Design a protein around this ligand. Sequence first.
Ligand SMILES: [Mg+2]
Ligand SMILES: [Mg+2]
Ligand SMILES: [Mg+2]
Ligand SMILES: [Mg+2]
Ligand SMILES: [Mg+2]
Ligand SMILES: [Mg+2]
Ligand SMILES: [Mg+2]
Ligand SMILES: [Mg+2]
Ligand SMILES: [Mg+2]
Ligand SMILES: [Mg+2]
Ligand SMILES: [Mg+2]
Ligand SMILES: [Mg+2]
Ligand SMILES: [Mg+2]
Ligand SMILES: [Mg+2]
Ligand SMILES: [Mg+2]
Ligand SMILES: [Mg+2]
Ligand SMILES: [Mg+2]
Ligand SMILES: [Mg+2]
Ligand SMILES: [Mg+2]
Ligand SMILES: [Mg+2]
Ligand SMILES: [Mg+2]
Ligand SMILES: [Mg+2]
Ligand SMILES: [Mg+2]
Ligand SMILES: [Mg+2]
Ligand SMILES: [Mg+2]
Ligand SMILES: [Mg+2]
Ligand SMILES: [Mg+2]
Ligand SMILES: [Mg+2]
Ligand SMILES: [Mg+2]
Ligand SMILES: [Mg+2]
Ligand SMILES: [Mg+2]
Ligand SMILES: [Mg+2]
Ligand SMILES: [Mg+2]
Ligand SMILES: [Mg+2]
Ligand SMILES: [Mg+2]
Lengths: 153, 199, 394
Amino acid sequence: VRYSLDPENPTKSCKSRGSNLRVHFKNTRETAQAIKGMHIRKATKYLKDVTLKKQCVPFRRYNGGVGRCAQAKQWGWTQGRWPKKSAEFLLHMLKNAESNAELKGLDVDSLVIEHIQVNKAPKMRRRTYRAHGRINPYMSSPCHIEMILTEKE
Amino acid sequence: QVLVLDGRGHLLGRLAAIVAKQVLLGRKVVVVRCEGINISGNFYRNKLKYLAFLRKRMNTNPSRGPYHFRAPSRIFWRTVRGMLPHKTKRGQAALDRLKVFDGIPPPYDKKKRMVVPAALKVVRLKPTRKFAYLGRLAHEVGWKYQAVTATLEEKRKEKAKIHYRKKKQLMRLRKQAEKNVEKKISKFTDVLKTHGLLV
Amino acid sequence: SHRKFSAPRHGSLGFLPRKRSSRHRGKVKSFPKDDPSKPVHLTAFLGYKAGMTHIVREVDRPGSKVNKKEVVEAVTIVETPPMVVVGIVGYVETPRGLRTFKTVFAEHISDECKRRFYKNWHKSKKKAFTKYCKKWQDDAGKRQLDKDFSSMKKYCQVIRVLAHTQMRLLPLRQKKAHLMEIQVNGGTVAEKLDWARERLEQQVPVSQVFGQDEMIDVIGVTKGKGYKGVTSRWHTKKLPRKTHRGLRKVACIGAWHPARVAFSVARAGQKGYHHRTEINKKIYKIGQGYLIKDGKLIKNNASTDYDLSDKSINPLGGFVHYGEVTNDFVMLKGCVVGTKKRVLTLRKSLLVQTKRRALEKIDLKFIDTTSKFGHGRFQTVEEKKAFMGPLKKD
RNA sequence: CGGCCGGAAAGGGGGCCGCCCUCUCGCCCGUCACGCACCGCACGUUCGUGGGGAACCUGGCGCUAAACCAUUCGUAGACGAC
RNA sequence: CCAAGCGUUGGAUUGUUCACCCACUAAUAGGGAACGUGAGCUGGGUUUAGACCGUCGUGAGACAGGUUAGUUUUACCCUACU
RNA sequence: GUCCCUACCUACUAUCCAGCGAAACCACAGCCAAGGGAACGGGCUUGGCGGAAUCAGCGGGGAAAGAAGACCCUGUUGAGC
RNA sequence: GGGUGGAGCCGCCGCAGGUGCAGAUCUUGGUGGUAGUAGCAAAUAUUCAAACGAGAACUUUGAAGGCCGAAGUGGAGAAGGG
RNA sequence: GCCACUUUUGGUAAGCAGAACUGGCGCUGCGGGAUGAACCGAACGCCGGGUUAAGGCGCCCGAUGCCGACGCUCAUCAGACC
Ligand SMILES: [Mg+2]
Ligand SMILES: [Mg+2]
Ligand SMILES: [Mg+2]
Ligand SMILES: [Mg+2]
Ligand SMILES: [Mg+2]
Ligand SMILES: [Mg+2]
Ligand SMILES: [Mg+2]
Ligand SMILES: [Mg+2]
Ligand SMILES: [Mg+2]
Ligand SMILES: [Mg+2]
Ligand SMILES: [Mg+2]
Ligand SMILES: [Mg+2]
Ligand SMILES: [Mg+2]
Ligand SMILES: [Mg+2]
Ligand SMILES: [Mg+2]
Ligand SMILES: [Mg+2]
Ligand SMILES: [Mg+2]
Ligand SMILES: [Mg+2]
Ligand SMILES: [Mg+2]
Ligand SMILES: [Mg+2]
Ligand SMILES: [Mg+2]
Ligand SMILES: [Mg+2]
Ligand SMILES: [Mg+2]
Ligand SMILES: [Mg+2]
Ligand SMILES: [Mg+2]
Ligand SMILES: [Mg+2]
Ligand SMILES: [Mg+2]
Ligand SMILES: [Mg+2]
Ligand SMILES: [Mg+2]
Ligand SMILES: [Mg+2]
Ligand SMILES: [Mg+2]
Ligand SMILES: [Mg+2]
Ligand SMILES: [Mg+2]
Ligand SMILES: [Mg+2]
Ligand SMILES: [Mg+2]
């Protein structure tokens, strides 16, 4: 399956992909932008104390109504939030990519997330029941994630 | 390449009308001693005009309202930016080349400052009309630093006279040396007098 | 149309950005205007709000109904341990204002004052002023840092000393000592600076700053009351019971055609913790602190010459939410701005004061020291057990 | 090349005293000939060691920190903030 | 005359704007802001459909005549202000 | 406590987070004064001036949103009586 | 021209038309901002340990604390559901 | 249908209503009158050079930065172009 951004060398890059994952796109996009430049061990250590509410995800684009937090000051931002469905799905995806690196025979402790990308998935449908006999749509917004890890010292 | 204008005895808008044009023609202008800018018309009409300008505050947020600058240098700055097209970026790059100063600060005290005869009170008012000092107007409309700047300017004047006495001394040594040297510069002077420089 | 019934507007617009104060320490916006005739003296001091109690004193104002009668009057205790002076700073008058010139610190400054330069004293390695204090112990630096006093004696008009509280002596959890520029108002600038460079790294008590029955100004931040409504903050009229969307509001914000809402209209936001200056607070008594004299300490800093007890200024069970005042204190008339255990600034008065109430001599004759943690019935522990008798536990 | 002063409003690359050196050079007239004379042709001539940004170089003398989160406080507090 | 800095109220009657009166007062001046101000409130009045009375109309019904009961919807957007 | 004259306490909210998450509305959009103008501008003119991204409220303004005005008039459009 | 694409297409002369969109509070389909927002607030209330499990505020068992309180949050019907 | 010079009717009057002559606007840009359906100049294919109209030439803003001419004018509400 063709990814959006080709790696500069497939001999050193290991890749992973998760299609149609039922988490919110706006949370998952920004918790991917949090880790778009990290080492893989620092990335997993980040994603665990995102769940444990000790380091936050700076909500930078999809940020309306998101309340402030004290932990966002270390991202040079005011707003932040600690999502955990998004954290654990692209934590399982790092376990997938880290399995693929040892399948390809790569040095695990030097992997850096080169490219990470969250797209919108085909939006599943539920209904809700509103006043005066009306019914409004109540969709869910799942996401497609792809990710490329790359060895660098 | 930097034009240092004096400010004493110059009319306010008559000076600003040419400071604006030299600034738009790319010439970095620093006017100095904006205390002694004088405005025509008498003091009470000019103070009534500035108090009427103070009345013009925005009703719902006077912090967003017109900033009435009380310093004389910034009164002159605002009356130049009235004459400049300060919304456009050439007018904004124009105002960055005007540099106003209350009194004469030490970057420009030991520099020879220029006078515009075409904007000056003794030239452009007939002498029975009565003018109005911008320094006194700004002071008793609420500029807090008249006496401080007056003592600092008195300190500068009593030091510029120490400079000028030495300049007089050097010119007298020069014109007493020239008579000692007139036997051996008799032919260097004569070719200057035939070409109109020393007679 | 106009208002049918004219009425004065709620609130004052002079205090208008009713926000949280950026400072916790009250800051002196104007020290008293200097004159070269008087001898040199500090013009401000810091203290800590302990609490409130009574006073009984005989009033001498010829003309009132209370001449040679005895009122009671509420007072405020401000614990004021002596402040350590740790620097001076000079100021030169400029046409753009009053610029700072040359700050000169002392040699040895205490590590309760060193706390102030650190947002986290634990994680730090306490390295402040270490390369600076070595200038005082070599001739390469001594001729450097007295040449600048010689320039401060030429180019400075205003010399402000730089003191700090001494929070080792206070009952508080905090150890980070507040520090303050205090303007020295006195003779010429040479006298003014050759007075204070001897006060450098030593004490200044209260009794050589202030005196008794002097009016002073209290600077400080109010007791913060949170994000409160418009009837709680601006005291606007409560709308009647029948209102649909709530009744603790301002009904009409503004008119139609001024198409904004004005800055004068009462709105709902922060109430309290505002910086305030409150003038003409009178010293009734400058207390003397606890000191040990010949084995046993002397404690009676609330004994008057009409009472003759051995009770301290402390009530039974201490000042509620403060602790016990073991230091020399200042007893202000009436209430002052701030909650308990809050830093307050005492400023000498900007005004000249020849009034019949400002020139009044104060000679107290009782100080209430009963328990503030409830309706206190007894002045002291000895009189309490003398009235009660032996208990079950005794 | 070493010392004495001149500076605060937004601080003076200025004057002076010595030294070990060095020169009859510079400036104004003349004498003598040389220096790509690049063959009629454009942005040449400077302030220019320009301002900023990285990596290379060799040496000398010096430096080994705080901030923020997390914990706590409750003089503060919607949440942050303090 | 200079002058809008600061005030200009509490009530009985009426849906009242106006009006009238009691009492204090220093004074109880006049007004403008879409005849300020209903996503601010109230709904007494007018101005729906139910009703009764007078007058007019043969009649359905009509009345700048009276009386009685009669749903007052939404802000999370942007600006403004706090 | 209807008010003078407001104050305090409790529960569920609102607020913050974990998860799940819509709708009305939308020409482009949003800072003001005056001028002229379809005779009341966010846009034009002359000025005032203008600083990322945002949070809790608020009810001035968008002549805010809903509903091809229900009052009035025109219709050679009707119906009930 | 370049790319994708995998089975048909066009120039000229004549002929014929259901022949050209920005609008119709246009018809049908999709998608934004609002927006990670309003909100998920009627009827008092949950807590500890263990088990199964990849996983537990919500399942189950045990204990404890509560409620409906015999006109019930109980036990059984008729209509309806299938 | 509307406006304007002059003639003119009703009305206190109106950016009101009703006429006559002619020109405009509507159907129409452009320079000027800051702003502008109608006023002053002028009506238009796309451009280069020159020159004007009405209006301007302290500065915004092209042009008086003429050694322009003769007077009047002091305003504690100056004055400033159909
Ligand atoms: Mg955003
Ligand atoms: Mg919002
Ligand atoms: Mg619902
Ligand atoms: Mg239903
Ligand atoms: Mg009034
Ligand atoms: Mg109601
Ligand atoms: Mg008490
Ligand atoms: Mg109205
Ligand atoms: Mg309403
Ligand atoms: Mg409204
Ligand atoms: Mg009614
Ligand atoms: Mg009716
Ligand atoms: Mg909310
Ligand atoms: Mg959430
Ligand atoms: Mg524009
Ligand atoms: Mg509105
Ligand atoms: Mg509406
Ligand atoms: Mg209609
Ligand atoms: Mg007809
Ligand atoms: Mg019919
Ligand atoms: Mg096929
Ligand atoms: Mg066909
Ligand atoms: Mg279309
Ligand atoms: Mg189409
Ligand atoms: Mg919410
Ligand atoms: Mg049953
Ligand atoms: Mg059963
Ligand atoms: Mg007419
Ligand atoms: Mg008409
Ligand atoms: Mg025509
Ligand atoms: Mg035309
Ligand atoms: Mg005009
Ligand atoms: Mg004509
Ligand atoms: Mg031409
Ligand atoms: Mg012009």
